Structures are given as C-alpha cells and as structure tokens.
Design an enzyme around this catalytic site. Sequence first.
Site, PDB file in Angstrom:
ATOM      1  N   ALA H  95     -12.751  35.846 -24.404  1.00 11.09           N
ATOM      2  CA  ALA H  95     -12.415  34.467 -24.064  1.00 11.09           C
ATOM      3  C   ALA H  95     -13.382  33.898 -23.034  1.00 11.09           C
ATOM      4  CB  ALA H  95     -10.977  34.391 -23.548  1.00 11.09           C
ATOM      5  N   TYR H 130     -10.121  29.510 -16.825  1.00  9.70           N
ATOM      6  CA  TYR H 130     -10.756  28.200 -16.730  1.00  9.70           C
ATOM      7  C   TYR H 130     -11.241  27.924 -15.311  1.00  9.70           C
ATOM      8  CZ  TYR H 130      -8.228  27.656 -21.151  1.00  9.70           C
ATOM      9  OH  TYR H 130      -7.727  27.829 -22.421  1.00  9.70           O
TER      10      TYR H 130
END
Lengths: 166, 166, 165, 166, 166, 166, 165, 166, 166, 165, 166, 166
Positions: H95, H130
């Site tokens: 990811a 993030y």
Amino acid sequence: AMKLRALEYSDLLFVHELNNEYSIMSYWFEEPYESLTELQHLFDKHLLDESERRFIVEDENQVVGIVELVEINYIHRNCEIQIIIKPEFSGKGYAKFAFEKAIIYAFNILNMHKIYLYVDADNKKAIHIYESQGFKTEGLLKEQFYTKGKYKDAYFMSLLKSEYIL
Amino acid sequence: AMKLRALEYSDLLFVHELNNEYSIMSYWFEEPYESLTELQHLFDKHLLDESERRFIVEDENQVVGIVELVEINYIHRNCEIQIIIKPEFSGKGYAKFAFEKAIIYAFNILNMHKIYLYVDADNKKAIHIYESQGFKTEGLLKEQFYTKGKYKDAYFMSLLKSEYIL
Amino acid sequence: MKLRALEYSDLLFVHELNNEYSIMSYWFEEPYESLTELQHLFDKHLLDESERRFIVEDENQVVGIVELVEINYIHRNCEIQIIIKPEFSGKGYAKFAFEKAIIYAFNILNMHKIYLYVDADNKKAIHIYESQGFKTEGLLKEQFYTKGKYKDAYFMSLLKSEYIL
Amino acid sequence: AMKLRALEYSDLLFVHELNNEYSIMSYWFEEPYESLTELQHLFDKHLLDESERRFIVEDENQVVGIVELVEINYIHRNCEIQIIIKPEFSGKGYAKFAFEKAIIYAFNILNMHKIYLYVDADNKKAIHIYESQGFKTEGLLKEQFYTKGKYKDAYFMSLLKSEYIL
Amino acid sequence: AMKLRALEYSDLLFVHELNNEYSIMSYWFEEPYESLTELQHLFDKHLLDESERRFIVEDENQVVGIVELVEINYIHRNCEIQIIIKPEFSGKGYAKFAFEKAIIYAFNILNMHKIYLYVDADNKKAIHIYESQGFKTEGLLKEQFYTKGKYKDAYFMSLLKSEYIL
Amino acid sequence: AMKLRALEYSDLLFVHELNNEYSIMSYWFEEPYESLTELQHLFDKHLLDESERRFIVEDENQVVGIVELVEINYIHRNCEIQIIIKPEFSGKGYAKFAFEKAIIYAFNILNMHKIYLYVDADNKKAIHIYESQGFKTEGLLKEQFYTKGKYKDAYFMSLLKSEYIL
Amino acid sequence: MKLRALEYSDLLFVHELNNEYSIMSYWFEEPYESLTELQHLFDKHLLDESERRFIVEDENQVVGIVELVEINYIHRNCEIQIIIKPEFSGKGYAKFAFEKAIIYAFNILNMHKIYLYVDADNKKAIHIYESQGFKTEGLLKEQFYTKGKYKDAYFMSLLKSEYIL
Amino acid sequence: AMKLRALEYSDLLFVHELNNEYSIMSYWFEEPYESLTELQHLFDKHLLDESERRFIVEDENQVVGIVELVEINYIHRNCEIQIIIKPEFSGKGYAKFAFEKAIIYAFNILNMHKIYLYVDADNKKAIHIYESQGFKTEGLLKEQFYTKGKYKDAYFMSLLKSEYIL
Amino acid sequence: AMKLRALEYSDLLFVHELNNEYSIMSYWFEEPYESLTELQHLFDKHLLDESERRFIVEDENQVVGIVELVEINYIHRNCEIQIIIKPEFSGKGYAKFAFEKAIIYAFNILNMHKIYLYVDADNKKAIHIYESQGFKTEGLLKEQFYTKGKYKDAYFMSLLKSEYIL
Amino acid sequence: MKLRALEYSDLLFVHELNNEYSIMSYWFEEPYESLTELQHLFDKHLLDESERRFIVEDENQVVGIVELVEINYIHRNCEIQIIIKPEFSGKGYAKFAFEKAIIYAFNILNMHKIYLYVDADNKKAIHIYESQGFKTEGLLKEQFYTKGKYKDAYFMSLLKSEYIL
Amino acid sequence: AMKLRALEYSDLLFVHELNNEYSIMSYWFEEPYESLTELQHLFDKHLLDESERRFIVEDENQVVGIVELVEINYIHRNCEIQIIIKPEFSGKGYAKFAFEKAIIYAFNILNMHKIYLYVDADNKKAIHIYESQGFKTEGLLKEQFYTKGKYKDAYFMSLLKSEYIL
Amino acid sequence: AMKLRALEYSDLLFVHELNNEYSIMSYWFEEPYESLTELQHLFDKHLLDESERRFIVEDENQVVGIVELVEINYIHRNCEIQIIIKPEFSGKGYAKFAFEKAIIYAFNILNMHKIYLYVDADNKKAIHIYESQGFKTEGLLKEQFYTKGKYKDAYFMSLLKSEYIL
C-alpha cells in the site's frame, strides 16, 4: 433421389463457383464476376424478399445445380424461372427434373398464373427442353442482351397454368 | 414421459427440418420454403412478441414435434392453436398429449377464454383428435386456403373455457 | 363519391373516428388511439402490402373509411372492414363503399375470396353484406368482447366465382 | 356533460402544470419535478406501451383533469387506477364521474378482472369517493411512501368485476 | 460455506432451467416460459438498472438458488424481495440463509427503510419462513393473481428497518 | 413549346394525382394506390438510382405529364420507356413530342443501344403512337398482366438505335 | 416567489447567467458556455436522476437558479448550489431559494445530509448558510482556482437531524 | 520489484474479484455488487475518459491491488486518490509503495496542484499510511457515507504539491 | 493454364504484400503504404461499386498478380486498365496474358468502347507490351506523377474497340 | 467580380445550370440532376478535400461556376472546369474566372500542374485556355459521348513553372 | 467598452464572412474557402471540445472580431492564441484590448502556464502588438507555411505566466 | 536487413509495451498510460487519417522500434517526425537507419517540403543524431512541456527538402 431445397447460406460456396463461370453466365446473360462477399451480402439483403425463391438441385449425394423463381408478382401472378446445372453434372437429366419441380412449385404452391423465361436464340438445347415442358416462344427480343462481345437476341418464352393443368 | 418446452434458438434446426417438408406444412396450409437464416431471423424478431407462444414437444429422449399458440388476443381472450408431430413419430399418441398440454397452458396460464384452430375438411384424423379434446365445428370456410394446387375447405374448430371445465 | 388512398393528412378524421365508443364497437375495436399513435402506425405500415386503407368521400367532405387487411397473396383472401361516420348514416354510403372495396379486391388485387366478421346482433350490417352476395360460413360464439359482453360473430364471405355471376 | 378522451401530445402542457404541483403529486406519492421535455419524452416512449392508458377528463367547455389505467397486466387481469382533478375544479363532482367512467372502461372494454389503487391514509376524501364506487380496503401499507417529510402509509383499495356487476 | 453472489451472464443457464419450471413459477405467480435468448436479452437490458439486484445463492459447491431485490425505490426507500431455491436443494435451509442475507443487504447496504413481498395465501411454508424473519401480513389482495387456472389471493407482507434493528 | 425536365420533389403532388387514377394506371398495369408519403419515400429512396430517369413533360404554361426511362441496363444498353399525359391534355399531341424527346435522350445522351416498352394490346392509340416513332412489335405476352378484372395481354415493342439513325 | 423545474425555454436566462465572470466566480466555475452547449447538456442530463435544477422566480420574472447535484441515493447526501442575478441582489432571494431547496432535499428526496463548497472570502454567503444551520466541517486550502488565484473553500454541511430541531 | 501499470481489459477479472468483496469495498464506502459484464461496460465507457487514471499494482509475480486517480480536474488541478490492496497481501508494504507511486504520477505527470482522499475516521491504519506520505486532515465529514448499516464519519485528507517537494 | 478470377477477401493478403512494395507501386505511380486493415476496409467499401472490376491473375498453382479495370464510365464507355505481376514471376509472359484477358473482358463483357492506361515514359517494357496489344499513344503528360523524388512523364495509351476487332 | 465558396443557398442557380442541355455538353456531362440530388451531393462532399467548387459573380448577381476537382495532393495536380451562363456569354467572365481559379490552384493549394479536358470542336474554349498558357498534351479520340456523337478531347494542361514566367 | 463573449451559432454568419477573405486568412496561413454549412458542422462537432475556446470580440454597439484559445493542453498547460479584427474596424486598438483580455482569460481562468502563437514574419504590426503585451520570439520557422504563392516563414512567439505576473 | 513497414493492428502489442514505458514517453513528452484497448481504438479511428503514417522499424528478425510521420499537411507540405526505438535494441544504429528512411519517404514519396520535430533540450543524443541528419534548431520553446515533475524546454528542429537534395 433428387430434390430442390431452399437455398442456404452454407450453399453459397457452390453457387459462387457457379456464378463466376464464364461459360455458364454467358448463356444466362449474366456477368462472370461476383465475389463471395458480394454473394453473401445479396443473400442477406434478399433474405426476406418475397419476390424470389432460390432452390438448390441436389441428387442423392452432392448438390448438382440451382433453380430460381425470381421477379414473383402476386398481382399479375407471374414469375421468371431460371436453372443452372453445373457442367460437370450435365446430361444426367437434372435440368428437366428441377424444371418440372419448379413449375409445380410455382403453379400449385405459389398459386401463379403464368411462368416465363429468357433464353438465347442460339441455345437450341434449352429451348428444346422448355418447349418439351410446355413453354411457347411468345417474343423475340432482338439484340436484347450483350455477351461474348456480341448483341444476342433472346426468346421470351412462357407457360400458362391453363396450359399445364390440361 | 413426454413434455412441452419453450422453443429455443438451438431447436430451430429441428424446426427447420420441419418447416421445409411439403407434406407436413401442407396440413398447416403453410409454404414449405424457409431458409435456416430466415427462421433464425423470425425467431429473433418475435423473441419478445407476447402474441405468440411456440413450444417444442419432446418425449423422454428426442424432440418429436412442435405446438404453438399464436394470434393471442388479450382483449377478446382467444388464440389459435397449431400442432405438428414429425411423421416418423406418428401414431404414437404424441399429438393428443401435445394438444392437451397446449389447451391446459392456454386456459390455465394465459387465462384464455376460447381456443380456435383451422383444419382441412379432409383431414379426418386431426378433426377426430380435436373433437376428442372438446373442440366443436363453428364454421366451414370454403376455398379458404390454397395447397397442392387446389383450394381446400377448412373447418374453424373451437373450444370455450366454460366447455372445458366440465 | 369515391374511394381514395388513405393519406397522412386524413389521419385527423380517422382519429376522430377511432376514438368513438359507438363506432368501434361494431368493429370489436378498442376506442382509444392518440393521434401520435395513429401517425406512428401510418408511418410503420406505409409499405405494408398486406394493408389497403381507403378514405370514402362524397361530393364534398370525407365520410368514412374502408380497409382491406390481412391480405394473403398465396391463398388469395383478405378481410374487409367498413366504417361510415354516424352523422352520415342511412345515406347509402356504406353500400357504395362496400361495392367499391369488393371491386378493388377482386379486379385489382386479384383476390379469390373476401371475408369479414360481423356482430350477430348487427342486423343492418348483415343485410347489407348479404345484399352484396356475402354468405355466412360460420358462427363464432363469444368470439369478441365489447361493452362488457362477449359477442358472437358471423364470419361472412364471398367468393370471386360467386361474384362474377 | 363530462367525458374521458385519449391523452394527446398537445395536452401535455396541461398535464405538465399538474406534475409540478407539490400538493397534487404528494397524494400520488410522486415527485413534483418533471420538465415539459421529460414529459414529452415519456409520452413518446410509452406511446405504444399497452400496459398504460392515460385519459383526459374534460367537461362541457374545457379540460379539467386526468385519469389513468396503468400497470395493465393481461395475465392476472389487474390494472391500477389513478386520478387528478385540477384544484380549481374541486367540489363539482368531476372526480366521481371520471372515476366511474374509468371503471367502466377498465371492466367493459379492457376486460379486466380487478382494479386496484393506492391512496394516502390521510386522504379520507379520496377513500370516501372510492368506497362510493365499490372499492374495499384490502391492506394498509405502513411507511410505504415518503412525502412531505415523513414516511406516509397508504391503503391498497380495489374492486372486483364481480362486485361491480351486482 | 454459502454465499449470495451478483448474478452473472454465465449463471443464466441455471436461472433458465429455474424460470421454465411450472412448479416454481406457479408459486412465484410468474409464467413458465422464457427462452434463454429472452433471458439473456433481459439481462443485457437491465445490466445498468439500479432498481434491481439479482443474487445467486451458492453453497460450498454448486449454485442452489437465486434471490432478487427488485423494484428498488430510492425516494420511498423500499424494494420487493423474492427467492427461488431449486426443488432439488430444498429443505437444506438455503432459503432462510439467503433471505437473511438479502434483508441485511437491503437494510445495511442499500439503506432501505422497508422490504416487502407478495406470497400466495395457500403457501403456508413461505409465509411461515417470512413471519419467522419478521414480515407481517400487511394486505390480502383477493384474486390478485391467476395461476394453475385459478384466481389466487396473495399476502402482501413487509418488514420495516425499525422492526429489524430491534 | 413543350419540353422535358428532371422530376423534382415539388412535382410529386402532380405525379400523385396521376398514380391514384385507376384509368391511367391500368394502361401501365400498375395499382392506383400510392399515398403521397409513399411516393415521397420512393422518390427519396431512388434519388441516386442510376437505373432510372423520370422526366416531367411540360408545355408553355404548365406541367402536362411525365415520361420515364427505367430499368436502364448499362451492360446490355436497354431501357424501358413509360409515358403518361394527363387526360385533360389529350389530343394536343403532347405524347408524341414527349416520347420523341425521350427517345432522343435515351439514345444521344444515355448512349443506349435499344429502347423497349410494354403496351396493353387493347390500347391501339399508344401502339399507333409508338409505331409512328419507329417501334416494332417483338412479342405478345398473353395474360402477362392482371387489371380491370382480367388477365390482359401486352405487346413488347422496341426500337434499336440503328433503326432510329436511319 | 417559487422554485420551478428548469425548462429548456429557461436556458436563455441560464446562459446569460453562466457567462458572467463575476457570478460564476463564487461558484468556482468557468464563465464560458455557448447556448448550444447548454442545450446539449440539458438534453443529455434530462433523465439524470443525480441532478435537480430549479429556477427561482418572484412575482414577475425569473431571478435565479438552484441546483441539487451529485445526489447519491446510497449515502443520502447531495451538494447544493445557489445563484441569484446580481441585479436582484440584497432583496432576500438567495435565502428563500436556499430554504426551499433544503426543504426539497430533505422532505422530498429523503436526503440525510446537504453539503456545499463556499469561498473562504465570501462572508455574506457563509453567514447566509450558517443562518440556515449549515456548519463548517472543513477548510480545503487552495481547493479552487479563479481570478488567477487559488482560493480555499469551506465545506459547509447540514444534517437532516440538525434540521428537524 | 513492485510496479504500477495501466488497467487493462484482461485485468478486470481480478478487479471483479476485488469489487464484489464486502470487506474491501466497505473501506472505499463502495457497494460490493458489480457483475463482470457491468465492469466491462464501465471500462469500455470510460476508456477515453481523461478524468480517470486507473492503475493495477503488481509485484514481481502476481497482481496485488489497484490504485486509481479519479475526479481529475484540470482547471483547479486536483484529483481524488483511492488505493486498494488485496487483504491476502496485507502487511507486506504494497500500500505504501502504491500510494507513493500514485502521488508521484499525479504530481509529476498530470501536473496536479493538490491530491485529496476520503478515509473512514475509524480506519487508523490507512490514516497513518496517508499521514506518513504527507497528507493532512483538512476536514471531518460526519455521517458522510453509509456502510455496514451505519453512517460513518470521514476524514478529507489532502496533500499540496508545494508540501510535497519539501 | 493461367486464368483471371474475381478478387476475393481472402486474396487481400497477397494484394497487401503487393501494395506495400515500393518498386511495384512505383510503376503504378501509387504509394507503397497500406495496412491490411485499410485494404480490407477499402474492399468492403467498394464491394458493390460497379465502377471497378479487380481481378486476381493465377497460373495453374499460385497467384501471380492482379489486373484491374477502374474508372468504368458507362456513358462514355471507357475505363482505365492497370496490370501488376509479382516481380518474382517476371519474364514468364503472365503480363501479356493478363492484359489480353482484361481487354477481352472490358470489350466483350462490359461493352466498353475504349480502354486507356497511364504508363511511365521510361517504362519501355510495359510500353512495348501495351503496343503489341493494340494500344496507341494519344498524349504525353509531363510531370503528371511524382515518384522516387522526381516528377515523371506519363504516356496516356489507349485502344478503341473498333481498332481491336481488326 | 469575385470567386466565392459554393454555398447551399446557391445550389438553385447551379441546378438551373446543371439541367441545361447546351451548357453541360461542353463539359461532356449529362444534363439531368434534381435539386434534391444536388443538395445530397453537396452535403456528401461537404468535407471532401479533393473538391473546390466556386461561384463566379460580378457586381450584382451570380454568373457562373468554377471547380477544381480530382485534386491529388501527392502528384500536385487537379482538373479545372469552368461554366458561365450563356446569358452572360461574350462578357469576358470566363477568362476572369479561369484566371482566378489558376491563381487559387497554384498560390493557395500549392499545385504543380492544372489539367483539363476540352472538346476538340470547341475553338473558343481552346483559345481561351491557350491564352492563359495551357498547352495541349494529347488528343483523346472518341473519349466522350454527347449529342449522340463520340467527341474527341484535347487534354490541355499548364505547369506552375510555365506560369511563373 | 469592448468585451469578449462566447462564440454562438448565430455568430457564425459573421465568422463566415471572415473565413472567406483571402487577405485575412493569409495571415493565419489558413485557406479562404469554408462554406457556411462546413463552418456550422465544425462548430457543432467541436461544441464540447475542451481543447478550444472561441471568443467573439465586440465593442459598445456591434461585433468587431474574434479571438480564439486553441490547442489547449491540460498537461503541459500551453494554449495557442489567434485573433482577427475585421478590416473595417482597423486602427481603433481593438486587437490590443481583445488580446489582453484573452491573455487574462488563458492565465487567470484556464490556469495555463504558457501561451504561444505563430505570426507571419512579414506581419510586423501583429509582432509589435504581441510584443507590447509581453510576448517574446522563441523561434523562426522558415518556409513553414505556404500562402500567396510562396513558402512564408513565421515567428513562434509566446508568453509565460511568470513573465506576465511581473 | 532492416526495413520500415506500415504499422499493423497485430503490431499494436509491441507498440503498447512501447507506449507505457515511462523512460521512453518522458523523452517523447508523452504520458506512460495507454490501455491496449485505447491503442486499438485510436488505430481504428485513424485508419484512414491521411495526416499520419506510422511505420514499424524491424531488423532481419524482430521488430525493433517505430517511426511516425504525423501532422502531415498537404498545403504547407510539412510533417512532424518522431522515432522510438526499444531500449533493448538501442545502440544498434536502428534509429539512424529509420530516420533516414522516414526522411526519404517524406521528401520523395509524400512530396513534402519540410520536416520538423520537437526534442528535449537536455537530450543531447537525439539532437546529435538529428543535426547529423540535417535538422537545424529553428526554435527554443521554453517550458513548453511538463514531464518528470519539471517544465522542460524543447528544441523545435527542422530540415528543408532544399537542404537535403543538396
């Protein structure tokens, strides 16, 4: 055991090899040029055309030729007849059998009142078969067609149902 | 164990062999000319047409015939029934079973108020089969259809739903 | 008088005629059809050779419609239908229209038989048809449904042979 | 002096003014947002849809409302009925007569076996009008619709042709 | 390990064999007639129809049945539920599992406010399962459907999210 | 003071009035049924059809008739000719001059080798007019057309360019 | 006053409104759109259920436009946009239009939340929205670009629960 | 050696398996219903749509996930980023790599001025991933999405290009 | 036993290999760029175009070249002839045979009045072959075509049908 | 005077010009073309870059047509055709139109050669062309067919090199 | 008292008169041949083309010219600028103000990073106007265009947003 | 034995693997994103586009690269040239051979008057090859492109036929 059988897409192959033969199309007043794609396109185009009926003449084994009841008119009750037997299977009487079958179909099924055809004036064999079946030369169209570099005349022949029921 | 089934695109083959037989289609007053391409086109055309319900009749092993409900009128509540069984399976009682199942479907599924059919006055077999199922002759149509070179007379047989529940 | 080919411009009249509950009952037809639906069906069956729809008009205006439908060119038969506006009833328009339609069906379309469905209770229409030679070939009991009742229908017909006598 | 007529394209204007009134569409549980373009598109799209039949209700001088027989099922023979009389013509009994003529059309012409309808539970006027015509409540759908800020309940009323012929 | 899985074109085969069974469609109030071509055409037609969601119930091995959340309304927030388990895999509890999965999908994913269904009044097994899951008979539509030659009544049943979150 | 012009869409009105007169269309063996919509559709459909050439015949002040060179075959170089002068302009010789100009067009512009035509045997006037222009009967098709209640016979007349240059 | 369904005949006005450099800046929109493009998009999204475009009109003529866009029927949210012609500014039209739009979104479309993007520098619009219950849920810095500058945007929103109080 | 690739029509299979998983699509706030036919239709629909850039994430051997850049606005210069990695490959760092490559593509190819994303307030893992890449929380959207039967709150995280070059 | 045949869709392969050769197409003044897809598109485009007659030249075993009749004008009765023979079969006399057969077809089938062709002034071989078949030089077109970086001069050779029958 | 781009509204004139038996004979063209066919071909070849059809008009009305056809962009050649209404004959319109057409073909289309077919018996046209520099490069005997006779055709042409001298 | 507006269909007339003036189109290196039909077709074809933006320049009373931002690339952020003021409005400074407003639009609204343009080397007026607005010559394409009988050279001028903000 | 060969649909595979390589597209100022479906769609779209000509550079064995003559203008007689050799076959001199072939094609076949190209200012190898072939840097477009996160300048280079014929 011979039979006339509704023309099929799969049969077009044969018909193609039949429609590009100069020897055959010349007597038919046609042109010996018709790509298989053009033939398939016209088959799809006239699939539902009720003014036509294209049969395949086949014996016990292979397909020997084709018959066609074209220009069928349901007001005047008449149609043009045209047969093409492969030169390889000529002389076996296929033409006469298929012609009789087509006349029977036009008169007893399509309820036609008159069949007609165009033949070359010099093609005495076809005229002989037709006159044997009943057709009478109703017209001489002089220089009506152009084939093999010459303007050819043609007998317009025809046969009435009243002359066949007798 | 015979049964009725919805006509499928794959069955058209059989139906084709059935629709190009002169003898079979003569009873239906139909014409025995119909290329497989034309049959497939008509199938795809009437796929969603709710005015028709074409069935395949099949026994334990093979397909034997075809029964059809056409001209289905949902205001007047009636429809025409048309049955065919391949001649090679004739006399085996398939026609009676197919007609019974078709009447059952029309009355108990489509909520029809009446069934009707056109039969050749000379076809005594089909007339008897229809009578044994309750149909009554409501009229004689003289020279209504043209087959085998002759104008044939036709019985318009019919069965009401009220007459059927008794 | 004259029969004429049905024209798009005439649909208005036909519309006013097809939405009348009394007129369409003699036909066993539903009295509902928007002008848009009528125009769409006109354009749809423009080249449908199984149809021949005529306008019946007198010296001045249009008075009715005739229709040779379900024309089968193999069996040589076709159904005939006639509708004259009630405001022009009793004037003899129906008989002239029926005559012209039979003449067109036999002498132009080369038909072998002309059939029609008439209500068993409609005595006037049955008499008009019989006067023209039509002979009842059957009685279809509870064939149609109108005004809430299942009406029987006489299937009357006329052969071209019986017409040339 | 009040009749039903077939809905025409030219009438859409009128219908448009009705389909954008929140007060009117709420009773129908519909949305009061429909551009004239969308209305015309829907009219053209369902032109040949036989599951519908939209009538215009008009009195002796002008158009006053709209009735509709929708969801016409030709197997179970049931159709939903809807009605809208413009608010400016309220109290003149138009709803009663138009609903009566629509019932007569559904039963005597469309040969339907049952008519049904949904009516907001808070709309006792419409319930009374329907009961006067012979409708009987068959169910109460609770929080089945959403309008005016709440999940509203609706009575499912209906009338059988047998109950009507009496 | 069972699961509901978005209906696929490849699965239509099964569904076809499922939608032409009279025994099944009768209880579903449907008609046992749907050619595979018609089924594929409707699948392609409603591919992007957001008012539907057709799941396939499959166990650890084969596909056992189908569930369907149809007539989904995103203003009123309600939809119809309908399950069909193949008679061969009946009694294995598949129906209850798939029904629970579908209710969970409608309430927790589609954010519905009320599910509903139509069942035959004489089909006490389906009504039993539904009442076990939470559905309450909100209406009795008398003679609302027509199957097996009889006008059948139907329970309109439904279940609110407020009655399921508890 | 009489010329030929190209057929225009605006002229169809005139042509329409001609194609619906039984007396006029009988000589052509055509049907006197052709809606203006159908006529316009055919005009648009054969707009680029090079096998046709429809001329309008007009005198010094108004349109008086129509000539047509149809079935133009660019291999055999033969075209059929047809003519219609409105009955109200009969006896003024328009047919002669228009036919002459059409012959000149077919030969000197279309480079055709032969012109042909069908004429009812009972129409001695048209036969005389054609003979005056150089046409010779080449056949008599008997019961080839059906009109006015009978199977009528037609003469197949024609003219070669060689016979015309003389 | 009233909100009304946007009609093709109204596009002219909308055109005159969508090509104004000052008006469309508050929306972060480009002030370029031919009448042909506007009509093409009208016909395109005619049946787009994710859109609800309203015309705001007073006693006499049209005065503005409202739009409930990006309507998600699963999450039950939608963006709201309001534009009143400057010639009718300060007359209170914006507040009435916003109120009617919220009522339509909650009580007709059954929405769960109504959000909007407003320029951080547009104090009047922010106050109008807050007076209607909208609460700033975020600040998107340099989110939009207009008049040559990257403008930040307040993402204001209102829950239906906070609306029924 | 992990890499990003342009989403191809052949990869849809994998994507299908990814889009019909409840758990995976719950994080995206998406619905886990999407037939392969629907996915292929949407792929062919947005083939030339320049507002989207869908990527396949693949390691040295197999495909592991999918990263996508949607709602690409070329005037305001921003776009939404959405990453998914198959759960069976979770914890392997795919990811982070996919997000890095997607940010690199958006800023250094599409010349974007800002990237943004919606994340579930409870999804602390994705929030941390993030944040480690530079994104900052610019707002909290309460009850913005509806999943698993609950209205979840969402962080609107974003990263400016200026903040990214530092 | 060499022969001419109607160009088929399957032959395009060969034709492709022929149309992408710089040397071969230089004589035709043509460009040697034409994807097989483009060739198939042009074939399907001109399938029914009666202004062209493309032929395949084939000996007893393989296909050797292609002769074509283009710009066929049926009013002026002329057409351009274009012959190509694969260089690997050069010097074997195939070009003479193909040209003879093409002239025979044009004059004795299409009823042409004249044949013409464009040849490079420097191509003495083709000039001699055309002269031996009866063609005469009717004009010299200077700098008419551009090939191999130079404006080449072209002889416009032609043969009348009258000159051919002698 | 001026040459102008052919416009749909001009087709009427062109129609009146294309159905004249005398005018189209100098072109070897058939004098038959319905206004509908002309409009259909106009719409068909609207974007056909191998065509450049000009209207020739004087101070007041339209007087003729010019056409640069069969434009080959590889060999840099194109055919030129000119037709002036007979009612305006002898006024010098043909020469001006031909000059403007040559200028357009060489200085705008970047052509290398301009060719044309003229009837061998048409002395006036041959002289007009030669005065403009066109030189006969061949004689096509019995090339065209008009007024029942096979007419020969001079293939006249002009190189851009011979034009800049 | 001079503004820019969006190009409308009704304006095409004006634009038409501009696109057929040799003197005007030469500076653009375009062809002065464009039928109003072709212009309208192009307007409709590029209606939704986002790579374009055609503005109409109008003063206080009438339309005076046209500006255009074409080849708008949303990755490299560069757009070509073109301008035409009708010759009858020359010397009134319209070109300057319209070009200024177009620069402002390209930079402040379209968020472009660079504007570029081609200008004939012999057109010193346009070069002076562009230089006044901040454009700098970046290249000289020699014999890049062909007009007025010669291969003309063009300067490639351009302006960066950074140079403009100063 | 190397050669440039008209691009074929079958070759698109290679081109796909060539058009998605970041390293290659970066120097080409292109984007490394183009699904095979998009590539096939653009191939079909520009099949008949006469403003392009895409060749494949292939050695005696495998395809090594691609050349493209795009933006071909037949009035100004100029076109853009662009070559892409696979990094695996770099250094073999393929680029120079294909560049010479393309210049010869543009000048001697397409009859072009000037070729041009855009190259990165920092890509000294490509500039070296071009200047070796004849191209002269006619312009420096500063920050004309955006790749790898940077606004890159580009040399607009070109070569006139007059400078190549010498």
